[PDB]
Amino acid sequence: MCGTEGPNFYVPFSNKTGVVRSPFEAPQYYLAEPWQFSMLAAYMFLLIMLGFPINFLTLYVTVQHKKLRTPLNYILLNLAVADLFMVFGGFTTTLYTSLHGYFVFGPTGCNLEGFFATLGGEIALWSLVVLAIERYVVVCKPMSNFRFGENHAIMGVAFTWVMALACAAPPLVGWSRYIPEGMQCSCGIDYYTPHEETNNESFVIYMFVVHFIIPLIVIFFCYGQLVFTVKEAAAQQQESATTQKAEKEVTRMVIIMVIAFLICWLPYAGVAFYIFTHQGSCFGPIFMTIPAFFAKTSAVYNPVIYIMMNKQFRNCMVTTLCCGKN
Amino acid sequence: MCGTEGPNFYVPFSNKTGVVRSPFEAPQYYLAEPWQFSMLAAYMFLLIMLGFPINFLTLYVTVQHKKLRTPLNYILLNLAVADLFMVFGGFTTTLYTSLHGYFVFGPTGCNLEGFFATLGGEIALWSLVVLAIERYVVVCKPMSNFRFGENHAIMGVAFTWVMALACAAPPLVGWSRYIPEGMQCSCGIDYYTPHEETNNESFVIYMFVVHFIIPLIVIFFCYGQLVFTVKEAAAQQQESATTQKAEKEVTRMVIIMVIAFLICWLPYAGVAFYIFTHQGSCFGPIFMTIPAFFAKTSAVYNPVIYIMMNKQFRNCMVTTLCCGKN
Numbered sequence: 242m243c244g245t246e247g248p249n250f251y252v253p254f255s256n257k258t259g260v261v262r263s264p265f266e267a268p269q270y271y272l273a274e275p276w277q278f279s280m281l282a283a284y285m286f287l288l289i290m291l292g293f294p295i296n297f298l299t300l301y302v303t304v305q306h307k308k309l310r311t312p313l314n315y316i317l318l319n320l321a322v323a324d325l326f327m328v329f330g331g332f333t334t335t336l337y338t339s340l341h342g343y344f345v346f347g348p349t350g351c352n353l354e355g356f357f358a359t360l361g362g363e364i365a366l367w368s369l370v371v372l373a374i375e376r377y378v379v380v381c382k383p384m385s386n387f388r389f390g391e392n393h394a395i396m397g398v399a400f401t402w403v404m405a406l407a408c409a410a411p412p413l414v415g416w417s418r419y420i421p422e423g424m425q426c427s428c429g430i431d432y433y434t435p436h437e438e439t440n441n442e443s444f445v446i447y448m449f450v451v452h453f454i455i456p457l458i459v460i461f462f463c464y465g466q467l468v469f470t471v472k473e474a475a476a477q478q479q480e481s482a483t484t485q486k487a488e489k490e491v492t493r494m495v496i497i498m499v500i501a502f503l504i505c506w507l508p509y510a511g512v513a514f515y516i517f518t519h520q521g522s523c524f525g526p527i528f529m530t531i532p533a534f535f536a537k538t539s540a541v542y543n544p545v546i547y548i549m550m551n552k553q554f555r556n557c558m559v560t561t562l563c564c565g566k567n
Numbered sequence: 568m569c570g571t572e573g574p575n576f577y578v579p580f581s582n583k584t585g586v587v588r589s590p591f592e593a594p595q596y597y598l599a600e601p602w603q604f605s606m607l608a609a610y611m612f613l614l615i616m617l618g619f620p621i622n623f624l625t626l627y628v629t630v631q632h633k634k635l636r637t638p639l640n641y642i643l644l645n646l647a648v649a650d651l652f653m654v655f656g657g658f659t660t661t662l663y664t665s666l667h668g669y670f671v672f673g674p675t676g677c678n679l680e681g682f683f684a685t686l687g688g689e690i691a692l693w694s695l696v697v698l699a700i701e702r703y704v705v706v707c708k709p710m711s712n713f714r715f716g717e718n719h720a721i722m723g724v725a726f727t728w729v730m731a732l733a734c735a736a737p738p739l740v741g742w743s744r745y746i747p748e749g750m751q752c753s754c755g756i757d758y759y760t761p762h763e764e765t766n767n768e769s770f771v772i773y774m775f776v777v778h779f780i781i782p783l784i785v786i787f788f789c790y791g792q793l794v795f796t797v798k799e800a801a802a803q804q805q806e807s808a809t810t811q812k813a814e815k816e817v818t819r820m821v822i823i824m825v826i827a828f829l830i831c832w833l834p835y836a837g838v839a840f841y842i843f844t845h846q847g848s849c850f851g852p853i854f855m856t857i858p859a860f861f862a863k864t865s866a867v868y869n870p871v872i873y874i875m876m877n878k879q880f881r882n883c884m885v886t887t888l889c890c891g892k893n
């Protein structure tokens with residue numbers, strides 16, 4: 242008897258006291274104090290104030306500067322759009338519902354907010370996977386006679402959408418489902434209930450393999466071979482100080498990006514391992530939602546790492562922000 | 568009968584309904600809805616998350632990099648400390664009281680939070696005034712045989728403290744007073760009550776002249792002469808492209824800083840002019856507090872303009888953040 246159970250939701254709180262209400266009808270102030278909902282709102286406000294400008298500005302400086310519109314940068318524009326999906330589909334909606342103490346948009350806004358918030362995070366995840374593959378192909382040159390072109394970059398973007406739809410769409414059709422999560426103010430895939438009517442268990446395994454394990458392997462393989470290829474070539478030209486500097490900075494950026502991915506990826510693995518073991522105990526609204534809580538920050542630091550730390554993007558943004566000067 | 572009146576406070580709400588309570592005892596939810604207090608909390612959280620790192624990091628990179636510890640930069644360290652006073656003395660306290668709906672620290676925490684929050688904003692104001700004077704003396708060279716030294720920079724910092732104490736201390740001694748302001752969650756100088764026991768009217772005139780008009784004149788005079796002196800000298804060396812570039816960027820930075828000062832300064836003048844005229848009508852909790860609401864942002868954008876846009880500070884912060892590399 243961990244929580245209270247009903248049609249289209251699961252409240253992580255026992256109803257032996259009789260105080261539990263529908264997360265669509267009444268505020269869930271037994272899960273957390275009202276000020277904790279306000280701090281959830283403050284967190285959403287922080288993410289919106291930092292997440293929209295950075296991501297929208299990536300799309301804006303690309304319009305003003307011709308040198309940014311290269312095929313290898315298409316996946317970064319896709320990343321910026323994905324974060325805006327997280328910012329408006331997820332963070333903005335949650336800020337509004339948080340101040341009500343419950344998900345005021347009903348069971349259908351759950352499918353809406355859940356889909357778009359899940360889609361944005363999925364598109365961002367695979368955009369990092371695709372960017373890893375694209376850079377691997379360009380540097381390591383695995384294909385004998387291959388040139389990365391505009392059509393190849395469009396496929397990579399379309400591939401993220403297919404993979405993101407592969408995760409976000411089944412819950413609408415009958416494989417898993419969208420229910421309020423955590424403090425019941427935002428919606429997402431139901432990892433919290435073994436709902437046999439929608440075969441939730443099979444969907445969690447599918448998510449764990451296809452959308453969790455595979456992205457880590459692909460990212461680790463591609464960037465590993467890239468750093469190996471770069472260090473191998475620089476070893477053949479140790480007379481060039483620039484090549485040695487270029488090798489150092491490429492390695493350092495790969496380390497930064499891989500550490501960044503792990504910071505978002507490990508909390509899910511740690512919590513899941515703590516649920517694989519310690520399986521018996523009940524779970525408050527912060528058991529599996531703690532990884533998701535901090536993963537929202539990726540909408541801010543991912544553009545900082547991949548776009549703001551890009552050399553050309555930075556100069557173009559400085560020029561754009563400064564009315565064209567400096 | 569604009570608001571309700573009592574010992575040590577003035578609530579901007581009529582008590583004909585009988586619902587008004589002491590801003591020290593009970594929440595002021597007739598001034599604003601609970602979610603509006605939460606948004607006040609979210610605003611404080613945004614200012615804290617942006618204001619503490621930027622300002623503390625100014626103090627931190629100065630410790631790691633010897634070239635930053637120049638006398639002309641002392642007033643910028645004073646500015647960073649001033650903003651931390653605003654961040655901890657003001658923003659942090661307000662975030663806590665906001666979630667209670669009233670000033671839970673009583674009439675004495677009013678004198679405490681009011682003093683330190685007023686002191687931080689005053690130190691920052693005069694630090695910009697002193698930096699304007701210091702740069703004017705160094706560039707325009709008004710004194711015939713003068714060299715700006717370490718002792719001269721220490722006087723400039725001490726001068727800001729004397730001026731800031733000249734404003735923040737009288738309310739504790741009997742000239743004006745500290746009362747809850749706006750939504751009664753933060754404390755400050757009483758511009759809202761003609762309290763004849765503390766001669767509030769004379770203090771407002773004193774603040775308007777010494778701490779509002781004079782800082783604008785000094786800043787406008789110093790930077791005007793500086794831009795004039797720089798453009799005059801560059802006109803004598805139009806063969807030097809760097810001098811012309813240096814003149815352009817100095818002028819552009821002065822414009823940025825003066826526009827920034829006006830953005831913080833004009834709303835006070837606009838509201839005061841709208842109170843000088845239209846004197847009869849009553850005022851909600853957002854009449855004179857709207858300038859103060861947006862002036863809190865100076866704790867974030869002032870370090871961005873004066874420190875983050877400094878050439879040496881930027882490279883030192885990048886090196887410090889990047890564990891010493893790049």
Ligand SMILES: *[C@@H]1O[C@H](CO)[C@@H](O[C@@H]2O[C@H](CO)[C@@H](O[C@@H]3O[C@H](CO[C@H]4O[C@H](CO)[C@@H](O)[C@H](O)[C@@H]4O)[C@@H](O)[C@H](O[C@H]4O[C@H](CO)[C@@H](O)[C@H](O)[C@@H]4O)[C@@H]3O)[C@H](O)[C@H]2NC(C)=O)[C@H](O)[C@H]1NC(C)=O
Pocket residue numbers: 245246247256258259260261262263
């Ligand atoms: C967590 O657990 C709590 C407690 O069990 C659940 O809350 C209860 O939900 C039931 C509905 O299933 C509520 O029962 C309904 O109450 C209505 C109002 O009752 C009050 O008002 C009447 C006056 O109209 C008073 O006389 C009465 O004493 C109550 O104070 C009634 O109108 C309903 O009556 C109808 O349904 C019943 C069958 O349930 C029929 O017998 C009637 O003839 C009539 O058709 C009904 O009694 C109950 O009041 C709720 N209790 C509390 C404390 O809120 C939550 O639903 C549960 N949470 C989740 C998520 O499931």
Ligand SMILES: *[C@@H]1O[C@H](CO)[C@@H](O[C@@H]2O[C@H](CO)[C@@H](O[C@@H]3O[C@H](CO[C@H]4O[C@H](CO)[C@@H](O)[C@H](O)[C@@H]4O)[C@@H](O)[C@H](O[C@H]4O[C@H](CO)[C@@H](O)[C@H](O)[C@@H]4O)[C@@H]3O)[C@H](O)[C@H]2NC(C)=O)[C@H](O)[C@H]1NC(C)=O
Pocket residue numbers: 571572573582584585586587588589
């Ligand atoms: C805005 O305006 C409101 C309304 O005028 C003010 O709120 C009132 O404040 C007064 C205090 O000045 C309150 O009066 C006191 O109420 C106490 C509680 O009364 C209730 O409970 C008793 C049972 O104990 C009931 O019988 C009664 O009907 C009430 O429902 C009393 O204990 C107090 O009595 C003492 O003082 C009076 C003199 O004031 C003596 O005659 C008594 O013998 C005894 O010594 C007193 O009556 C009043 O209740 C408040 N009203 C409301 C609605 O809150 C706010 O103070 C004002 N705001 C500001 C900032 O000034």
Ligand SMILES: C[C@@H](O)[C@H](C(=O)N1CCC2(CC1)Oc1ccccc1O2)c1ccc(Cl)cc1
Pocket residue numbers: 359362363366408445446448449452453502505506507509510513536
């Ligand atoms: C993009 C988003 O949609 C995706 C997700 O939210 N996921 C739910 C939790 C997840 C991973 C998938 O973690 C699990 C642990 C054990 C079993 C199933 C699990 O699914 C995700 C993928 C990678 C990262 Cl770095 C962060 C989030």
Ligand SMILES: C[C@@H](O)[C@H](C(=O)N1CCC2(CC1)Oc1ccccc1O2)c1ccc(Cl)cc1
Pocket residue numbers: 685688689692734771772774775778779828831832833835836839862
């Ligand atoms: C540092 C802070 O302490 C100072 C202040 O808060 N002030 C209260 C309002 C103030 C100015 C002084 O505006 C008035 C208008 C009419 C009469 C009296 C007035 O006082 C301040 C000075 C300059 C600026 Cl840019 C912003 C704030």
Ligand SMILES: CCCCCCCCO[C@@H]1O[C@H](CO)[C@@H](O)[C@H](O)[C@H]1O
Pocket residue numbers: 274
């Ligand atoms: C680093 C600073 C951490 C501060 C944590 C503050 C946690 C406050 O916690 C709150 O305290 C109130 C009493 O003060 C209680 O009434 C509330 O129920 C409780 O949630």
Ligand SMILES: CCCCCCCCO[C@@H]1O[C@H](CO)[C@@H](O)[C@H](O)[C@H]1O
Pocket residue numbers: 268336337340341342343600602
């Ligand atoms: C910019 C963000 C705006 C958010 C508006 C939040 C409005 C909350 O609305 C409040 O919800 C409560 C239930 O929790 C009700 O009891 C209150 O009557 C209602 O005012």
Ligand SMILES: CCCCCCCCO[C@@H]1O[C@H](CO)[C@@H](O)[C@H](O)[C@H]1O
Pocket residue numbers: 331355358359361362363365366369427428429430501502505532533536537539
């Ligand atoms: C480094 C990889 C970046 C991908 C970040 C995606 C984070 C998405 O986080 C996800 O958000 C969904 C909707 O809010 C929730 O349903 C999921 O529980 C949560 O894991």
Ligand SMILES: CCCCCCCCO[C@@H]1O[C@H](CO)[C@@H](O)[C@H](O)[C@H]1O
Pocket residue numbers: 460461462463464465468489492493495496499
């Ligand atoms: C998929 C993630 C792969 C990350 C590969 C990081 C490999 C780091 O490798 C290290 O890089 C340093 C760079 O100066 C060198 O000094 C070290 O000798 C080298 O071992």
Ligand SMILES: CCCCCCCCO[C@@H]1O[C@H](CO)[C@@H](O)[C@H](O)[C@H]1O
Pocket residue numbers: 335422423424425426427428526527530531532533534535
């Ligand atoms: C010590 C601080 C720990 C903070 C962890 C809080 C985790 C709360 O859980 C959160 O509940 C919200 C309700 O809608 C969801 O939107 C978030 O995705 C979820 O992470």
Ligand SMILES: CCCCCCCCO[C@@H]1O[C@H](CO)[C@@H](O)[C@H](O)[C@H]1O
Pocket residue numbers: 600
């Ligand atoms: C740009 C978007 C602006 C959104 C402003 C939302 C203002 C909401 O305002 C709130 O609406 C609620 C009903 O929805 C009422 O119950 C509350 O009393 C009211 O404060």
Ligand SMILES: CCCCCCCCO[C@@H]1O[C@H](CO)[C@@H](O)[C@H](O)[C@H]1O
Pocket residue numbers: 274276594662663666667668669
């Ligand atoms: C990190 C910020 C922590 C802020 C903690 C806020 C605690 C608010 O505490 C709440 O105040 C209400 C009065 O407004 C009381 O009615 C509630 O009983 C009390 O829980």
Ligand SMILES: CCCCCCCCO[C@@H]1O[C@H](CO)[C@@H](O)[C@H](O)[C@H]1O
Pocket residue numbers: 657681684685687688689691692695753754755756827828831858859862863865
């Ligand atoms: C460009 C000049 C920067 C100075 C910014 C200082 C802003 C201070 O703002 C002041 O804060 C006080 C305490 O919060 C309040 O009492 C005052 O009403 C308010 O004007």
Ligand SMILES: CCCCCCCCO[C@@H]1O[C@H](CO)[C@@H](O)[C@H](O)[C@H]1O
Pocket residue numbers: 786787788789790791794815818819821822825
């Ligand atoms: C105290 C505030 C003084 C601000 C002085 C700003 C003077 C701007 O002056 C302008 O600067 C431009 C720079 O390229 C020149 O092109 C213009 O000819 C010149 O008039």
Ligand SMILES: CCCCCCCCO[C@@H]1O[C@H](CO)[C@@H](O)[C@H](O)[C@H]1O
Pocket residue numbers: 661748749750751752753754852853856857858859860861
């Ligand atoms: C359209 C949005 C306008 C927002 C203006 C809100 C002004 C509220 O007024 C604010 O009240 C607070 C109560 O402690 C004080 O801390 C702030 O200094 C004061 O500016």
Ligand SMILES: *C(=O)CCCCCCCCCCCCCCC
Pocket residue numbers: 558559560562563564567617823864867868871872
């Ligand atoms: C040139 O590239 C710079 C042009 C001038 C921009 C300076 C102002 C930037 C302000 C950014 C900080 C805003 C703080 C808001 C905090 C809520």
Ligand SMILES: *C(=O)CCCCCCCCCCCCCCC
Pocket residue numbers: 291497538541542545546884885886888889890893
């Ligand atoms: C070198 O100068 C950079 C070193 C690596 C730093 C990259 C990570 C920076 C993260 C900043 C963004 C944090 C976002 C948090 C949002 C709440």
